[PDB]
Amino acid sequence: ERFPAREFQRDLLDWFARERRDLPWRKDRDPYKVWVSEVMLQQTRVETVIPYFEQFIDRFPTLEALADADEDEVLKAWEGLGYYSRVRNLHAAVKEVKTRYGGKVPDDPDEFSRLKGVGPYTVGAVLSLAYGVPEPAVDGNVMRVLSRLFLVTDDIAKPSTRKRFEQIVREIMAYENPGAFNEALIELGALVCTPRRPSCLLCPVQAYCQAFAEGVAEELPVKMKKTAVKQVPLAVAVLADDEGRVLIRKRDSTGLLANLWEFPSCETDDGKEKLEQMVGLQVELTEPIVSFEHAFSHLVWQLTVFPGRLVHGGPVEEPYRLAPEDELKAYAFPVSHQRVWREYKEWAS
DNA sequence: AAGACGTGGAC
DNA sequence: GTCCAGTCT
Ligand code: SF4
Ligand SMILES: [Ca+2]
């Protein structure tokens, strides 16, 4: 494996200095900000993350401010980003950093990795970029790039394949400046060596790329096809009382959409009667106004919205809470239920 | 191991 | 429609 590591390095790092996007989290190397951006970037595109990162850092300018904030306030800031246990884990990890480590982000891989939500990629991403620690930062971009560079045909969906890529990076990483190197590989996959129609002709490391020589760039990386996924009808109801207040409820911390608020729903494995019975509060449910789909990575919801009129015969017991329409802004809903409300509003016109 | 776990660009 | 931008269990 006569791979000219140093030669390869100098070129890649040169192209990076010329073409790097000026992104908000690249203004400096504050471990806190880098860490926040890398969590936001997990399975989430850069252009999507930019506005979230700006508001989040404005609301929580430092690690302590995030640790000090309330769970609701943090989760509201994550509303719409998806995979919401990321922020549950980041909040807890930061709380841990505050109480245990006195505010400083641990610079040791094994100590940093021990924190919730910090997987192999985030360790390398945060520690290299912000501390100089030469740990690999292998994401989907890197895997695709390396798979083509070294013509690796292993299924990237296998945890072992990733472990191999990490070993490859180690073999070729620029230990002088690992952060800059790690980001360069990622940026490469993001800008040049794209999932489709890679610009190999413009690529700075074309010379070293084994997939280019064989003309199989498009066919890599190898990855098992995503399968079809379970469908799940859902019955949702918007119960408004005479005064205009609407009833909502906070989902439990274990499972789908943990700790997010929603409109009282039940899986329609009978329709309305199930909603009616479930809440068994003196509530009456009416014709379903609209139906639609909302997808997940591992299932698909088919929703049905039933307006109802709430009559007060008792108190509001947890998890349920009663909220005026004006104060719904304060609660973090998932996108599925955000649409439920919008359709309800348009209907009531 | 492979399924859980959200959402929106870009074909 | 398909693909895809990580971590926990
Ligand atoms: S030459 Fe083509 S396949 Fe190889 S790294 Fe560059 S863009 Fe990717
Ligand atoms: Ca870890």
CATH number, domain containing residue A179: 1.10.1670.10
Nearest ligand (C-alpha, residue A215):
1
Where on strand C do bases come within 7 A of a protein Cβ? Answer: 2-8
d(CA A100, CA A63): 13
Q: What is the 3-state secondary structure (H, E, C) of chain A?
A: CCCCHHHHHHHHHHHHHHHCCCCHHHCCCCHHHHHHHHHHCCCCCHHHHHHHHHHHHHHCCCHHHHHHCCHHHHHHHCCCCCCCHHHHHHHHHHHHHHHHHCCCCCCCHHHHHCCCCCCHHHHHHHHHHHHCCCCCCCCHHHHHHHHHHCCCCCCCCCHHHHHHHHHHHHHHCCCCCHHHHHHHHHHHHHHCCCCCCCCCCCCCCCCCCHHHHHCCCCCCCCCCCCCCCCEEEEEEEEEEECCCCEEEEECCCCCCCCCCEECCEEECCCCHHHHHHHHCCEEEECCCCEEEEEECCCCEEEEEEEEEEEECCCCCCCCEEEECHHHHHHCCCCHHHHHHHHHHHHHCC
Same structural domain, A15 and A138:
yes
Choosing from A193, A197, A214, A222 the residue with most ligand 1 atoms within 8 A of its CB, the one to mutate for a pocket test is: A193
Residue A22 to residues A17, A19, A141: CA-CA distances in angstroms?
A: 11, 9, 18
**Same-domain pairing of A167 and A275:** no
A209 and A270 co-located in one domain: no
For residues A109 and A135, the answer to whether their CB atoms sit within 8 Å is yes
Residue nearest to nucleotide B10 (CA to C1'): A196
Q: How far apart are CA A197 and CA A310, in angstroms?
A: 56
Q: Within a 10 A sphere around the Cβ of A122, how many other Cβ atoms?
A: 23
**Number of alpha carbons in the 13 Å side-chain half-sphere of residue A69:** 23
**How many other CB atoms are there within 10 angstroms of residue A308's CB atom?**
20
Same domain membership, residue A197 and residue A234: no
Residues A286 and A192 occupy one common structural domain = no
Structure tokens at A249: 């409820």
Report the alpha-carbon distance of residue A178 to residue A346 in Å, rounded: 53
Whether residue A104 sits in one domain with residue A182: no
Resolution in A: 2.0
Domain edge (last residue) among A199, A229, A259 = A229
How many Å apart are CA A5 and CA A171, to the nearest integer?
A: 8
**How many angstroms separate the Cα of A4 from the Cα of each of A39, A45, A144, A192?**
33, 32, 20, 21
Whether A205 and A327 share a structural domain: no
Half-sphere exposure at residue A308, Cβ-oriented, CA atoms within 13 angstroms: 27
Query: Which of A196, A212, A229 is the endpoint of a domain?
Result: A229
State the Cα–Cα distance between residues A323 and A271, nearest whole angstrom: 25
User: Would you state the structure tokens that stand for residue A70, as one six-digit string?
Assistant: 């309330």
Overall domain count for chain A: 3
- Position A178: which residue type? P
- Structure tokens, A6: 């140093």
Give the CATH number, domain containing residue A313. 3.90.79.10
Which of the residues A1, A19, A38, A176 is marked catalytic? A38
**A126 and A56 in a common domain:** yes
**Which ligand has an atom closest to residue A120 CA?**
2
Four-CA torsion A37, A133, A117, A120, nearest 10 degrees: 110
Query: Residue A281: which domain range?
Result: 230-349
Together in a domain, A16 and A164? yes
The b/e string for A15-34 (b: 16+ C-beta within 10 A; e otherwise) is bbeeeeeeeebeeeebbbbb
Query: What residue numbers of A does the annotated binding site for DNA cover?
Result: 25-26, 43-44, 81-83, 121, 183, 297
Rounded-to-integer distance, Cα A243 and Cα A309, Å: 11
Cβ–ligand 1 distance for A206 under 6 Å, the answer: yes
- What is the C-alpha to C-alpha distance for residues A250 and A252, in angstroms, rounded to an integer? 6
Q: Which of A229, A244, A259 is the last residue of a domain?
A: A229
Cα–Cα distance list, A325 to A42, A138, A230, A240, A303 (Å): 33, 45, 34, 9, 21
CB A169 within 8 A of CB A136: yes
| CATH number of the domain encompassing residue A33 | 1.10.340.30
Q: Is A92 left (phi over 0), alpha (psi -120 to 50) or beta?
A: alpha
Cβ pair A59, A78 in contact under 8 A: no
Instruction: Check whether residue A26 and residue A127 sit in a common domain.
Output: yes
Q: Are residues A98 and A213 in the same domain?
A: no
Same domain, yes or no: A247 and A348: yes
Q: Identify the CA nearest to A45 among candidates A261, A191, A250.
A: A191
